[PDB]
Structures are given as C-alpha cells and as structure tokens.
Design a protein around this ligand. Structure first.
Ligand SMILES: [Cl-]
Ligand SMILES: [Cl-]
Ligand SMILES: [Cl-]
Ligand SMILES: [Cl-]
Ligand SMILES: [Cl-]
Lengths: 311, 311, 311, 311, 311
C-alpha cells in the first residue's frame, strides 16, 4: 500500500477532528498539559471502492495494517501520542472513516504577565507530511471538533475548544507539510487569591505602617523588621512552586514594590530617630506625620499605575 | 471476529461488574485515585452455543483471540487500564462469561469546601462504542459488583461501592455509546485534625490576646507581631502541599479570619499606645478592657457563623 | 492448554516459594514497598510425563506458551508484576519446575502509632483462581522461602521473611481462590532520632523555662514567643514529608504537649506580670517559684504516662 | 538484512541531519534536556537498485523491516530515543533517504560559574558502530540540519543549532565508531533576577547598615540579627531547588560575602557597645562613623573584584 | 535453542566486560545510580564452529533468535536493564562474540558517615543461572572492561571502573549461580561546602558568643535565641533533601554539638542574670569572663575529637 492516486493532479484531503474526552494535569511550571481525546480522520481511497450488491455488505471494516492510512503526527508533543484505533469503516465509494482514542502531553507556552487575572490559549498542532506520489492536505470539520461537558482543569474556566480552519501548508526538507491549529481557550479562576494571598500581604504592610504613630525607635525597628520577616515568611507560604519567570509579571511588580516600601519605611524610621537624637524634633515629627499620608497615597497611586501598565 | 447477530433487531447487552481488590493512592492535589479490581463481562453469542452431549463438557474455555469480545473502555482514565484476562467461559446456550483483572489511575473531581469534614464520590465510568452490524448496550450485574473487605484508603472511611444501573446512552462521533457510572463513596476521617492543626493554631492566636493585659507598647508589638510570624511559620509546617484551591474552603475561611484578627489586634495595640501618649489614658484603658471580652466573643461568634454557612 | 486432569476429585496443588533478591523504596507516606524476587512454582501435569529412554533426554525444557501454567497473581500490588520466566523444566513423571524473576510495588498498611520505635509486618499475598474443570490450591515449601543476605531497607532491621503455610481458600465471583500470606518482618533503626530530633526539641522547650528565673516581662515575652517560633521552625526542618497521619501517634502526642506547654508558659508569664503590676508581688513571686518545679515535673510525668499508654 | 557490499573497499557513508521541532524541559538540576526532532539518514544500498521504466515509479517506498538500515544511536542519552519512522524513499541508483521523528532526554554538562549571566552549548552525539563486512562512517548533510523558528526554552535565548561536520572516528571494542557533534547554543534571560533576587537581598543588607546611625545596643542587636534572619528567610524563598553546585558560582560568592558582612556588622556593633561600656566613647563613635562609609565602599569594591574575577 | 555441549565435563565460561558510556543520576536519597554501557559476552559453542575454507566468511552474523545466548541478569537493579543487541559474531572455532548496549538503574548502598569528605564504591553485579544440561560460570575479559573518558557525575571524582575477576559461585533455588562484581569508585567534590554550609553556620554561632561581652539580659536573650532561629533557618536552607540517615554522620555530630552550644550559652546567660539580680555580681562577671575563652576552646577541642573519631 501506497497513497491513493489523484483523479487529476489534486492533493489528498484528510478531514480531521479532535474531540476532548479528558483534560488533566495542566502544569504551569512545565508549560505542559495532558489530554485524552478522539482523533477522527476521513479521506477517499478509490482503490477501496466496492459494489455493495456483489459484496453483500454496505460497509467494510479493515485492520490498520490492511489499508493505507495517512501518518498524522502532533507537532508540540513531548513524545508521540499513545493511540488506540477504535474503528476503520469503508463505504462503497472508497471513503475511509478512521477513529482512534489517544493520550498526549502537549507543550504549549503560557504567558504569566497578567497572573492571576490571565487567560491562555492552549495549542494542539496536527501535521501531515507529503510523499512523492502525492501531496496530503489537512482539513477541519468543525462539527467533528468538540469536548466532553465534564472536561475540566481545576482553577480554570474552559471557554472553548476549536480549530483554525485554514491549514498552514509549507515546505520542509523538500516535502510539503500541512498543519492545523487546535485551540483550547482557558481563563483562570482568581477568586481565592484576594483572601488567600493579597489581603494578608497587605495587612502585614499595613502593620509596618503603625511605626508612623510611634516615637519609640526600639518598637519601630521591631515593627518594620519583624513585618519584613513575616512578609518573606508569607511569600514562602503562598510560593508559586514554579521556578521564577524570566519576565516581569503583574504580581511580581507588586511584590517588588512591597520590598521597596519596607526599605523606605526603614529609612524613615532611621531618619526620624537620628533627627530626634541630633536635637531636631520639629523635622523628625513633621516627616513621621507626612509619612502617615505619603505611604498609603504613594502605594495606592503606584498600584493604579501598575494595574494600568499591565492591563 | 465479528459481533454476534441479533435474534430480532435488539442491541447487544453486555452485563458488567466491578469488584474492588485494592484501592490506593488517592491524590488530593491531582484529583486522581489508583484502583485494582476485577472487571466481569457477560453477553450472549449464539454462534458459541453447543450441545453438552456431543461435546461432553458442561462449559467451554476460550482464548481472547478465539472469540468476539466487546471493547469496554473507561472514560475518566489517565491512560488505558493495564488488564490481564483471567478467564473466558462459554455455557451451552452461548452465554460468555469474561473476567479480567485491571489496574487504573482514575480522574475524579474533588470538592474541598468542607475539608477536613468532607465526603467524596469517586467515579469510574465504563463505556462501549457500538459497531457497524449492531448496537451495544451496557448493564449492571449486581451479583458481580462489590469490594474486598480489606480495601482501604488511609485517612478515609470507605462507605460503599455501587453502580448506577441505568446506563447513559448517547451519540458520539456518529455512533451510539452506552456509559455506566460506578461510584466509590468515601468520607474523610481525620481524627487528629483538632490536636494536630487547630489547637496549636488557636494557642498562637490566644498568646496575641495577652497584649490586652499589658500597657507596655514594646512588649505588645513583640507579642502581636512575633505571634503573626509563629502563625505563618505554623501554616508553612501544616501546609497541604496541594496548590491553593480556586474556591473558598471552610478551613480557608477560618485561617483568613485569623489573619484579620492579627491585624485588628495590631490596630488596638497602636490605638491604645497613641491614646496613652496623647494624654488620654481613660479611653486607652477602656478600649484594652473591652478587647479582653470583644476579641474572644467576636471570634467564637464568627466561627459559629462560618460553621453554619459551610455546614 | 487446559488444566491437568484429576486422578480422583482432588484439587491441583501449586507449590510456591518467594526468594527476595532486592527490597527497595519503602515509602512510609504511600505505605508501599518495591520488591525484586524469584517466584518458584511446582506442580504435576501427567499429560507431560515421558519415557526418558524413548525421548533420549532425562529433562524437557518448554516455552511458557507450549504448556499449561497456573495464573498466579498478587493481591496487594499497584499493577501486575513485571515477570521474566527464568526456567521451565519437565521431568519424566510430568513434574513442572517453573521459575521466574519478578519486580512489583506492594501495598501494605503501616502502623505509625509507636514511631520511631515501631516494627512492621509487610505482606505479599499470592493468589490463584480455580478453573472450570478443577480447583487450584496453593502450598508453601518454606525451604524455598528466603531472602538474599544483602537485601536491605535503609533505616530498618529486617528480621525475617516467611510464609503462613495454611492458604486462605474462599469463594469469589462463583469460584475458589487459594490465597498465601508472605510476611516480611522489619523493625526501625531509631538511633539518630535522639540527637537529631528529640534532644534539640527538648533544649528549645528548656530555654522557655528560664522565664521562671526572670521578672523582666519584655525578656520573658521574647523567651517564650521566640522559642515557640524556633520550635515551629525546627519542626519544619525535621518534618517527615508524609501527609499527617489520620490517627494519634506517640511522637504526635509529645509534640501536641510541647505546644500546650508553650501556651501554659505564656499564661504564667502573663499572670506573673499582671499580679506584679496590679500591686500583688507576693502571688507573682510564689507562682514563678512553683512553676520552676511544676513545669519540669508535670512534663516528666505526662511523658511517662504517654510512654506507658503507647507501649 | 546485512550491510550493502563495497564496490572496492570503501566505507559506507551515512549522511545525517537533525531538524529540531521542539526543545523543552531543560533541567538545570539534572543537566538534561528533552528534544523532539527529525533525524534524516542517507546511504547507498545498490541491492535496492531498480529500473524506473520496468517499475513505473521514479522512487520506491519501503517498510523498515524490508531493507537494511544503519543502527544509529545517540551517545549522551538517558535511554534510547523514542523513534517513529516517517518515510523511507529509494531512488533508482539504490540511494536510500530515511526520515524518522524522535524524542530524547539528552545528558549535557552545564557550567553555572557565571549564573544568571551564563551561556551553554548543549550537545547531541550521533554514533554508528562498524560491521564485520564493512566500515560505516557518518557525515553531515547541512541542507538537512536546522530548527523550527518557534523552538523555545523558557528563560533562554536559542542562538543556534549546528553540527561539527568532521566526525570523530575511533576504535572501540575492536571495531570502528564514527561520532558526530550536534550543538545547540543557548544564553540565559537574566532580567527578572535584578528585581526578584538581587534588589530585595540588597535592601535587607542595607537595613542592617542603619545600626551605624544608632547607639542603642538593644536596637542594633535587633537590626543586625533580625536582618540576618530575613536574609536566610529570603534565600529559602528564592532557592533554586537544585542541589548545591560542587563549585563556587558567581551568585554563590556574592551570597557568601553577604553572610561575611552580617558577621562583620555584628563585630562592629559588639565593639562599639564594649568601648562605650568600658569608658571609651571617643573610640566607639569614631568606629561607627567610619563604618558608615567603610561598609558600602568595601561592599561596592569587593563586588567589582568578584565581577572581574568571574567575567 | 539448547546450551552448547561440554567437550569433557567442564562448565561453560561466559567471559564478560562492561564499558561505561554514560553515568548519570546518582541519587543519594534513593541510594541508586543510572548507568548506560556496553555489555560484551563471549563463549564457545562448537555446534556453531565451521571450517573457513569450505565456508568462506571471516565471521558469521546471527540474530538473537537464531542461536543460544546465556541469560545474563543484574542482581542489584530496580527492574531489568533495557538492552539493545548491537552485534553477534561467530568465529570458525565456535567463539560467539555478543555485544549489547544497555541502560539500568542500579541499587547500591551509600555510607554517609564521613560526608562531605566521603568516597563510595558503586556496585554492578552480573549473574548467570546454570541450566539442566550444563553449569555456566562467569569470567572477566579485562580488554573489554572500561569507561568513556567523558563519563561524569556532578560533584564527584570518578576514580576507577574495575571488576573483581574471581566470580562468586553459589547455589540458589537448586542451581549453580555465578556472580561478578563490577565496581565504580567515586570520591566527593567537597569544595563549596566550606563557604556555602560550614562558614555561615559558624558565623551564626559566633554571633551568639558576643553575649559574653554584654551584661544586658534583654540584649543577651535576643542574641542567643534569635541566632538559634537563624541557625535553624539556615539548616532549612542548606537541608540534606534526603530523609534522615539512621546512623550518626560527621556533619550530623557537628550540628548536634551546635544545638548543645546554643543551650549551654542560654544556661550561662540565665545564670549570669540570676547571680546579678541575686546580689552576687562577682560570681556573674567571673563566669561571663571565663565563657569568653571556655566557649571557643571547648568548641575547637570537641571538633578535633569529632574529626579524629570519624577520620
Ligand atoms: Cl504524535
Ligand atoms: Cl481503559
Ligand atoms: Cl501479579
Ligand atoms: Cl538513541
Ligand atoms: Cl537485568
């Protein structure tokens, strides 16, 4: 067996579809997700055409080995998918209806710049390589592209599963390659982030700010430095567990600013005490009183600037 | 190696049964569980019916490749189950009795809203795809559904193993499919949750409340802030290792409240000292005295409200 | 390729023997252990008997596929064992000397109530399902049950590897199952626990007791609260990495008591200071002096009670 | 299924080419990287020569089992690559053009001395063992060497993918081996390191330097020791998760210096207080005043020396 | 498919050789190491012996399935090695020369008593089980035992790869077994340990010793207790990453001593303050002055004793 012959000079159309059965193991660190789905394939092989009358059958079932089947591969997979041919059906005209169940660990880049208010498009790229006898081209039947209602990823809302209908046909190592883009659109469930991370982090910072209503240098040193320890401790607790991102994220910028604020509050506490000790209590008291407003105001403003820059 | 022919036009009934041998590795982070069980299958194939007189034997044993066997798959699995056919028996009327031992990692969503007082229903979905010549329908043989008495999951109580007898018949990829729901009901047993996590966490909070029987601002700052560090430290220690849940859990709400209480106690400590320093000792002393009752009372009340809202 | 026929009505005896080559990966969290061993099987199939004179051979070697071999499975395994048939020998009377090398991850419950002074019995359950034509029964020859001298599990003393000679014969899914219990007895190597965990944990607690020889409330608050932070920090450092146990362990009770002691010492420190401040230095001094004896005595007593209750 | 015969005594040339489809999972700890690529192979096997006229076809397609294929292995792999033969094309002269898609976990040493400003050369070593009947030699078909434009490694810039055209031919276990070196050049994306690691670590160090504008020994002990705790805490937070490198890294030297600086600042704080207490306030005040300049200057100077020594 | 016949009554000698291609993944927690190597096997089979003059070939090449090959297994492996037969050559006298490339995860116990100044001997145990017709014995072909020059293990110096030429012949499961010991000798690269672990741990302890030049009980409590927190924190940072070792290690003893020293320094600080407060300043001042010398001296002496006892 070799590819079906062209009637004219036309390429062979392999109609595809992917139906998600299970989506699992989305890994933010590895930028990978595990999928379990159906892969449907449809094409015409006139060599396989038959007279249903003089055959006594309206359909013919074949073993994968018995007939020509296109070699469809996935571009962005760790290793080749584990596939199980579910069914192969041939109709009197030579139409082949192929179906397999497969599992695969798909590599898809994730953008964490807007985390935890991010949305992602997961990609699954189907590909076919042409042979010398004839060019093979992929097509999508969107009726055949879907997902089980029960499919889920914890912490994400799965908006849709679709395919970009126009394939990407290009030459590679002297042969045409036809590629399809299947997209899984997901948006993060950011609720518990406010009470679980942000609010507690904010409270610690706010505690450090009470040093602006105290003249006790010993109590102030304990306030700013102990809260810095509590902040670091809290970040270890709520730690992403992923190796640090190469780029600056939204949450990343806020956290950097919180460290800057702890340093600035230490400078203030240091300045106020030095001024007091160096017989200048009027300047010390005026700085501390300004800080009471300057600190929350500069914080709230910089946060609005960051929110604006990222979104 | 073709499906058994219908006597009329009826679909083929495949009577199923699952008998749990072992259940293990329930992973809370992954929402998966590993199972080891028997899968029994029974259907009628009249091409296999025989006369026990001119054969001699009351039962016939076949190799899987000698006869037609329905392809049963699991819907919610990572990869296909590891199976080993244990036995294939045919009775004189053509009734096939198939048995295999399998192991599988089943994906089943878990609800942590009532943790650690939560109960879960683990699902195992059997499925069969119909074939060209005839439709295949699943059924439950309750005589063949059960679990070994020694079956266990650490930290859980296994209430029951049962199946929803009526299958879910629907259409997939242009063919009819019959699905079954096997349910494993488990409820969390965490006897040690109180002593192990709760109490030490309450003691730390209670220590912060001793600041209401002290006028020393330096000692008060050390009490509230050092206990906040101890609280965060304790939460790192008793951390589940599972990424934070997208939703608000019961234990999650209690912990959020504990952070709020540390912030409120800091505000009090700050207010009391400012009033004392700003020549108002009457208002400072009256706030601190109120707090001694207000703090435990508001805590005990909010906890009753939370327990009521979640349960 | 059918079971050997009976001479009367007696069941077929499959003589077993397990010889441990390697024991590894004992996971306390998973309650699982990986084993690599020999499995010996012995039975008589008269259909295989031969005249050594006619044959010109005193022994006959077969491929597993060529003859009837009982289907032996393990009850408490994650998946079916990976096996390599090492040898199949048939003597003139039809005796089969089967030998295979296998690896398997065995699930065996572990009791942590007496940790780290615990001993465990690891189980390996062999099983055979009886067929249509005849009943199959397992037997042990203890001469054939052993372990390599080099077998080891880090942190454990392996006392013995044996089998309970009497099989457990029972009905399951309308057939007989003959089950064998192979036991691996192990006892933990608790030495480094004293200098690594116990001793530093006691020193931290002892430091909090120095607050009973101090009147300085600021120094006392620093002693009790900072040591509580050090205790929690130390617990994070020496943490088992296994999720907390559903039941109350011995070490678990001691740790709970240590948290209770930190809370009680805070109460004392708080009471002392309040009485001292509120014009009652006679009570404050008498409480602190009592605590100096009360604390070590109540600790040493409760510990004896706990050691008695657990052992 | 024996190697093609030589026309004279010439070795067989196997022309190779690797085209990267996906690159992923670079593991810094393991010094390994996962790759998914095409492996093209070409050689002349005259036994496969045909007349395009008698055959009809200008090219012949074969199954891997039908013809002799050289055994190409990778030297630096964990296990053998997972390969899937995409195409085998034979031209009339008997020139075979083989193409396979493979995935492999390649072991390649990484130098972390200049981290996070490091560049690495990842190696993939192709190898072929010569046979009894003839010597096999590898060659590079540069037309068939490349990488997909979309190839990415999070946190790295992929500079180039190339092959050292001259093979390394040597004797091993009495036969010739022909080895090829494919190189993937990558350079790290160090941006977020400044705001995420460097800057917050410098702020904690700077806070410790405020002890040089304070005479309060109690406040100074709190400053230096509490910041040391915050530093250690921060290091736990930003920890690589890879076991410590056997060699001294650039970042490793900076961190060692920061610990030295915390110790020196403690010595100063200790010296200043002892001089004050031992009736020498002139010496104490002159040391503290010097330290205010000495500390940032010696730090900035040692950092320039380190940056010079490493780069 | 039968073993070669003996010329007299001699056992069959299988000459072995292992050539290391790659060594990777040495895991200290798991006490395992992954190896990729060649395994050469040589034995004489006269049934395969041929006259070269009437045969006309240098060496005959066979497929594994075609001829008898001894079953060589590894004793200390997780699962059976993944092997790929590279070549099978037969010379006129019947000498079979077998070669395979294999990968295996070898289990080899490690002694951490002298860590990080330890050396280890990694073992690879080859084994062969004798057959019905003849006894099989292993031997070492020293020409075929080696390692690639590029073989590496990060953090270790690979000293040698040798084999103990005399096999260990013994009886197992009623048959003779010939065992060979291949040894990989490695010594640890302990450099970065001094600046990364030892030095910062000694600085934290040294800071605690400044309490001997202070009379301030509040500052002393902060020094000793806060440094104990910093020590524990540092230990979490530099943590072994392996579950605790059952035996007392060298580094383990030093760390235990450091905890003892923190407790002793607390006792001193407590004693000095009590003596001062209980009208005995002569006794207090003399203890603190003694401690200034007693502490570093007792430390340096106990360390010399430990280094002597372990080495
Ligand atoms: Cl694929
Ligand atoms: Cl399945
Ligand atoms: Cl098994
Ligand atoms: Cl390879
Ligand atoms: Cl092996």
């Amino acid at each position: 067996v070799s590819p079906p012959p062209p009637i004219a000079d036309e390429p062979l159309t392999v109609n595809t579809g992917i139906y998600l059965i299970e989506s699992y193991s989305l890994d933010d660190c590895a930028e990978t997700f595990k999928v379990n789905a159906f892969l449907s394939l449809s094409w015409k092989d006139r060599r396989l055409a038959f007279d249903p009358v003089r055959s006594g059958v309206r359909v013919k079932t074949y073993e994968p080995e018995a007939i020509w089947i296109p070699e469809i591969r996935f571009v962005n997979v760790e290793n080749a998918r584990d596939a199980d041919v579910v069914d192969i059906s041939v109709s009197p005209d030579g139409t082949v209806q192929y179906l397999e169940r497969f599992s695969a660990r798909v590599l898809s880049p994730l953008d964490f710049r807007r985390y935890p208010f991010d949305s992602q498009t997961l990609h699954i790229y189907l590909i076919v390589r042409s042979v010398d006898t004839r060019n093979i081209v992929l097509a999508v039947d969107l009726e055949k592209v879907g997902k089980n209602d029960d499919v889920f990823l914890t912490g994400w809302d799965i908006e849709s599963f679709t395919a970009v209908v126009k394939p990407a046909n290009f030459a590679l190592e002297d042969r045409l390659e036809s590629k399809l883009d299947y997209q899984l659109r997901i948006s993060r469930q950011y609720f518990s982030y406010i009470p679980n991370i942000i609010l507690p982090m904010l409270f610690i910072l706010f505690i450090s700010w009470t040093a602006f209503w105290s003249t006790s240098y010993e109590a102030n040193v304990t306030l700013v430095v102990s809260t810095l320890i509590a902040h670091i401790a809290f970040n270890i607790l709520v730690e992403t567990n992923c190796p640090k991102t190469p780029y600056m994220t939204y949450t990343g910028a806020i956290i950097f600013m919180i460290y800057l604020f702890y340093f600035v509050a230490v400078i203030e506490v240091t300045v106020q005490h030095y001024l007091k000790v160096e017989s200048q209590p009027a300047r010390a008291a005026s700085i501390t009183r300004a800080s009471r407003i300057a600190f929350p105001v500069v914080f709230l403003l910089a946060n609005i600037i960051l929110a604006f820059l990222f979104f």
